[PDB]
Amino acid sequence: KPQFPGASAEFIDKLEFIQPNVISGIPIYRVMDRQGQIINPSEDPHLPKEKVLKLYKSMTLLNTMDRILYESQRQGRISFYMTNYGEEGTHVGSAAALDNTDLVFGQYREAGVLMYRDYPLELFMAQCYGNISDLGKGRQMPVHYGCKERHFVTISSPLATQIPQAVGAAYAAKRANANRVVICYFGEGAASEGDAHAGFNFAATLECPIIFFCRNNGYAISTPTSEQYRGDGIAARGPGYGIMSIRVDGNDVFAVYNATKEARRRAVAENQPFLIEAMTYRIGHHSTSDDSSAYREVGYWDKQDHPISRLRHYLLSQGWWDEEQEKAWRKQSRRKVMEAFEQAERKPKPNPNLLFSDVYQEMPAQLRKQQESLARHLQTYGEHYPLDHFDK
Amino acid sequence: KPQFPGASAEFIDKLEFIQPNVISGIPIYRVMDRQGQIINPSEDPHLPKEKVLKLYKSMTLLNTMDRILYESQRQGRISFYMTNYGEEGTHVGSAAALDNTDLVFGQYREAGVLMYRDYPLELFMAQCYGNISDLGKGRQMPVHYGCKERHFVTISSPLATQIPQAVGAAYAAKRANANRVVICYFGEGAASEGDAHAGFNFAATLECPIIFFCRNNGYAISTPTSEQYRGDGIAARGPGYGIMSIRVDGNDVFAVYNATKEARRRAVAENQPFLIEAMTYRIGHHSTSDDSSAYREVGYWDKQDHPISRLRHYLLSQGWWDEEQEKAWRKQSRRKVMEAFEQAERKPKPNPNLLFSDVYQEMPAQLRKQQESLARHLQTYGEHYPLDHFDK
Amino acid sequence: AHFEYGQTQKMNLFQSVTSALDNSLAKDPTAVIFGEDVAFGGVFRCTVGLRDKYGKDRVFNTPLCEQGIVGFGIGIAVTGATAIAEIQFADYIFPAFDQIVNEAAKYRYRSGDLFNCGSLTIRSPWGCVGHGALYHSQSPEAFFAHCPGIKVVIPRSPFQAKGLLLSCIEDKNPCIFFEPKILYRAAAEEVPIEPYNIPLSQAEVIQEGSDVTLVAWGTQVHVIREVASMAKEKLGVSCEVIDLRTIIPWDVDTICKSVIKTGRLLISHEAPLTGGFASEISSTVQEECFLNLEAPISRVCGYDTPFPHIFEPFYIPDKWKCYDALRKMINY
Amino acid sequence: AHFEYGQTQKMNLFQSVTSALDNSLAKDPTAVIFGEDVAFGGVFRCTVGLRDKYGKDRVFNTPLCEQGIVGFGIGIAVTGATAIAEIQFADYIFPAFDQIVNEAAKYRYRSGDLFNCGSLTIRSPWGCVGHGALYHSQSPEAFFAHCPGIKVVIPRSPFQAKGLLLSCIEDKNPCIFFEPKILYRAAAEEVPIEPYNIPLSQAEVIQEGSDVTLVAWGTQVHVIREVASMAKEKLGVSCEVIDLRTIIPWDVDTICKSVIKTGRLLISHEAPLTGGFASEISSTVQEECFLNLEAPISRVCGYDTPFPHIFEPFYIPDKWKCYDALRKMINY
Ligand SMILES: Cc1ncc(Cn2c(C)c(CCOP(=O)(O)OP(=O)(O)O)sc2=O)c(N)n1
Ligand SMILES: Cc1ncc(Cn2c(C)c(CCOP(=O)(O)OP(=O)(O)O)sc2=O)c(N)n1
Ligand SMILES: [K+]
Ligand SMILES: [K+]
Ligand SMILES: [K+]
Numbered sequence A, B: 001k002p003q004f005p006g007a008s009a010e011f012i013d014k015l016e017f018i019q020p021n022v023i024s025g026i027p028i029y030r031v032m033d034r035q036g037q038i039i040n041p042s043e044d045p046h047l048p049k050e051k052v053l054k055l056y057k058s059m060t061l062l063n064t065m066d067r068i069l070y071e072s073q074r075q076g077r078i079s080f081y082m083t084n085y086g087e088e089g090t091h092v093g094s095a096a097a098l099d100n101t102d103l104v105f106g107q108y109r110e111a112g113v114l115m116y117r118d119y120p121l122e123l124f125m126a127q128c129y130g131n132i133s134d135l136g137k138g139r140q141m142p143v144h145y146g147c148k149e150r151h152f153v154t155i156s157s158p159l160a161t162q163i164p165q166a167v168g169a170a171y172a173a174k175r176a177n178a179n180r181v182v183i184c185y186f187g188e189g190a191a192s193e194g195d196a197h198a199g200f201n202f203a204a205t206l207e208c209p210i211i212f213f214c215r216n217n218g219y220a221i222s223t224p225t226s227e228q229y230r231g232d233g234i235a236a237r238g239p240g241y242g243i244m245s246i247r248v249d250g251n252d253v254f255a256v257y258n259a260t261k262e263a264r265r266r267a268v269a270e271n272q273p274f275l276i277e278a279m280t281y282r283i284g285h286h287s288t289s290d291d292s293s294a295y296r297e298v299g300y301w302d303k304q305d306h307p308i309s310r311l312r313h314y315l316l317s318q319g320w321w322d323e324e325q326e327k328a329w330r331k332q333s334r335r336k337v338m339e340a341f342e343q344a345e346r347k348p349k350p351n352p353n354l355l356f357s358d359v360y361q362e363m364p365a366q367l368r369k370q371q372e373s374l375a376r377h378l379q380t381y382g383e384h385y386p387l388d389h390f391d392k
Numbered sequence C, D: 001a002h003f004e005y006g007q008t009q010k011m012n013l014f015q016s017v018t019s020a021l022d023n024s025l026a027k028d029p030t031a032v033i034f035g036e037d038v039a040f041g042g043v044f045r046c047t048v049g050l051r052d053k054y055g056k057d058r059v060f061n062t063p064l065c066e067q068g069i070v071g072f073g074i075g076i077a078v079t080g081a082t083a084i085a086e087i088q089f090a091d092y093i094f095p096a097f098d099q100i101v102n103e104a105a106k107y108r109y110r111s112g113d114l115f116n117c118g119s120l121t122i123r124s125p126w127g128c129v130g131h132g133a134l135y136h137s138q139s140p141e142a143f144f145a146h147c148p149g150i151k152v153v154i155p156r157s158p159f160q161a162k163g164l165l166l167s168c169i170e171d172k173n174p175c176i177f178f179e180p181k182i183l184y185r186a187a188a189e190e191v192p193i194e195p196y197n198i199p200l201s202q203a204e205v206i207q208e209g210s211d212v213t214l215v216a217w218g219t220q221v222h223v224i225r226e227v228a229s230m231a232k233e234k235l236g237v238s239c240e241v242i243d244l245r246t247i248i249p250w251d252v253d254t255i256c257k258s259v260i261k262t263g264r265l266l267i268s269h270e271a272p273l274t275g276g277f278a279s280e281i282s283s284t285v286q287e288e289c290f291l292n293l294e295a296p297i298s299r300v301c302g303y304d305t306p307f308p309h310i311f312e313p314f315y316i317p318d319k320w321k322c323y324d325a326l327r328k329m330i331n332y
């Protein structure tokens, strides 16, 4: 009976404000409990042993690398780092549910997606050291990874900018009849930026095959979620845009996998966006620039509810792992990370001429004049520059 | 049983995406039908005769002024105009529910709020003509009204910028123990801007006494709502931010009044935001720059569901109006608008020196040098400038 | 008012833009055009007919959100598809400033050329229009000129607009193309119906002269052309008139060659003086042509205020303001 | 590394900012401070202790949304209350560019002074930091210099920062105050504990000289101070060293008086050359001091690229690049 174009609804003859349901919000999908036990058999994906061992080995290898590179930062060996502690399940559970060629846009606390896609340790290292092996040519801050071969778009610092970009890549995929999905990761803090409202709405109106994957780890640097929003987290925003949405236990690699697998299948078939909010807890500091004890419970999470521990218990059930395997893999991982670390530290940095290329595809003549001016400068004053560990 | 800081919820052991309810959305609150009949007696505000006549006279005087100024634009008498047709109910119903001193931020299609607050016809005219009586000193496009005495913040063209600003004014009101509410109007198109996501979330987390009032008139220039969003309009977004929300029949001055009255009472008592989406239909073109027949039903709205007609039927019931009064008021309004129009056209424009003041509170010496350079210029080349209808 | 390629037809500047866009979508199957109100043809008619001819998946309306329009276009371009975004007035490009300056411009550099958004072009109406006031009149090019990694291009006519717009669409770098809106329905001229290109980063000397160099872009080129005629008639002064065309990267060589010959330079633009792009041209010409300068380089620009409604005739750097500055410079 | 008011205490630049903010909230009951992570003291410690001392309603965290931070601060200021917003790094001010350029700067003008946001100040860490790369290092002042209606102020030291920040907070115009973050924990100096003001739009000649004028701001002032010493020792050249302090409105008179005396000018800044603020200073000094110029005005700036991680030592306009440019200019 109402005729207004902007909504489809009935009249109501009594004044009633709509109250948000925040106290009992959208429920948290779980597949296994904290002891690694399957709760509802009909939900178990029954992934094969080799794939579940890959989930486990990818998480723990990332954790090994994080410990080493966090210490290297503390020693001044690299300028910056950011760990993935407590969130390795969200990374690896979702990556495993994607096609190899699905395109990924991230935030910065995603490295497990690359690890699952077999990104070499040498290349994670090369980017953190800015050495000659870095395909990013040493130009970005550490942890700003990217890989064209593995369809992982280079990370940039400005939060949430990748959200509407991921939507555009997904529109282009739709047109290309790619049968590919784009996934876009961001944190609950970044979700406050205007570009999240842009991307969420554009994906719905333009009918794009995209998964928005929000990691809600309770903090954005020092800011707890009670100061970040007052609705029922990020999941409750999706339906307001017309987006199918779900909330999952981010410390449960099977719940994350099941949700991403189903969102991927439906987004690619239906050309519609899906939103997954994975609840988790940021166990580590925000970054090497943050001492989190200045504003916060961490040991509850680390000891009582961790994705690596939870999956270890599951393995230890199927009889697929044991203490001997655990020790041998801990040793082998550490060795592999240390081999890459040693190599990375002994590589030179790229030629300083590389500060001028790729600004435009072709260096403008005026930019080439500046390059030449640096080359002349270094000829005269080079003793005053750290030329000795730069290439050429 | 879940422990995650970012949400309050139960676990669920089955994978279920949350589906948006768009086909039967948030219902549309109505108080009177299209024949001006009260539908549910317990909802009738029983406003006194003098106030309801003020609602009616404010809408129709705005409509008279719109017809005249739209024609003046067509003749090249003023450079631009934008009508309020079909949306006069939302303006006047909500203004009547506010305190005189509640602060208003608008978009541009709000002029009935000023008309209800007794803004002189001479000053609406002065701004459209940019004449010497304009307190805005002729600097903005027509229809960019503002009045400090009547607490109506000067309109600016960029859409949605006033949304987070209104929130900040509301925070400052809260601190000042003002017992004042801020209301912020915008259209459903503007709601797509990132600044709407900013303002909505800040008002909730910072606990601000603000009413967000969205006019959803089915179009943003040529863009129908089906290309603007895919959720259940704007009302369904509010609860995702923790904002109490309601949708009303924007062509029903009593439904608009009741909702704004209650939102005002609760926002000022509770320091929490409210969102009202008023459904309406943009009867006129977007502006004098738009020929809407290029992309669109208008006569359905104009003849079958208009706020002025609906309120006229209600008056004609209580016995508070009749055809004789209608004709006399139509004559008197037209006379008052024409008197202001004549005066506005015969006033000079402001002194051209006024293009330099108020850039900063004090004119920087370098800006005064530019002023002096114009004065020298006009001394020599003044014959080439339209100096004759500018002051001094 | 204040102011060899096959078959041609008379086209005004809006029609020349539609012709460039049509040519682009005919020959590049990846190309799409999007923004606010583009589907029905656009508020300045620049996209009329294109959705009907090429399809709703290729010429389409977005939600009303400039940061989203640009982010979305960058994402299309990351996949290699040509993305031609519209921003409805240049005054409303600022919401997208972060996506343009922090993202588009830096995309190729920061990835070591693993990713890029070269196939993005952003087009937007620009410049004064007689009554546009603060938010329908702006000329934002100097804001963008301080951002390495984007190109900024401004044509003076229908023939120039089609060839420059085709070059932006096909250039492998994100480009902002500003269309002077006061020219959209001003005089037509002959424009080739088939595609052709005019190079970026190349100024055009449209009238040779020996006494003074005048440089401008957009509508202001017509102003300085008239100033040249005034100076010839009233002062017997020979002016070399140059359209800069590309703001960045700009054609330093053509401008410096001219000033070495003439020894005098006046640069004019509608945008405010302070921080305006005339500042960059002046300071560069000074560095390269110092020994040749007979008089200080003059900048005749908009005043350092917002752009006013009723005062526009007094605000703009019109032909009398340019002429008077030129007269003083000639007599320095 | 590359580089009378009552009781004082040694303070570094972060502590001087906290002292200005504390002084402001003590004497102005309307004042509030807000932005990302300010409540626990800020990521650079600038707000430590202030929430505890003045209250959670007065020093508070916002959601992670720069366009909202600035819009919100404008709204506080529209009511007359003092609003001191923080943007966490200047690199992330661009989301708020529309609210600053289209709204804050134009608020008073466009309303005929019926409304304003004069009581707004935006403070933000700025400038290179050794390893900040593209998004922790930027110096955006030239983007803002082309916007009439805002002031942009950059101090060189703790004493200068407190007095300039107090002036911005109390100035009746929206101000952007950029805090050079590489100085936050560098050397302390004596700073008055009670409030004091240093005027805006006033440069400071910190060392008199007769042969060449050097102009810079922020950390780069220390670079040019060292260049002056190098030029004295190695070339017997006497340099006049000037800290510009306010980018807009800038102190044209002090700079031109200096260049009329010396006949030479070198301006240096970390920001990229093209469209950088040195362009405005150069072109203005040229216009006003033309007959006094012995050599072309030199600009020694960052290169026209994004700001790199591993290459930062090669990117910055360090003392050797400035000295070499000075040497060439002296010999012109
Ligand atoms: C536009 C913008 N503003 C502020 C920041 C500073 N910042 C901020 C405020 C971060 C917190 C992000 O919180 P999150 O919840 O999105 O993610 P994590 O909890 O995984 O860090 S990370 C970071 O660098 C930024 N990078 N970009
Ligand atoms: C930032 C920005 N972008 C685009 C515009 C252009 N524009 C646009 C696109 C309008 C349509 C607004 O639609 P709405 O639904 O918000 O309101 P109405 O239907 O009442 O016009 S009005 C207008 O001037 C603008 N003013 N500001
Ligand atoms: K990003
Ligand atoms: K506005
Ligand atoms: K391009």
Ligand SMILES: [K+]
Pocket (backbone or CB within 6 Å): D118, D119, D120, D121, D168, D169, D170, D171, D172, D173, D174, D175
């Ligand atoms: K201020």
Ligand SMILES: [Mn+2]
Pocket (backbone or CB within 6 Å): A187, A188, A189, A215, A216, A217, A218, A219, A220, A221, A282
């Ligand atoms: Mn977080």
Ligand SMILES: [Mn+2]
Pocket (backbone or CB within 6 Å): B187, B188, B189, B215, B216, B217, B218, B219, B220, B221, B282
């Ligand atoms: Mn609308």
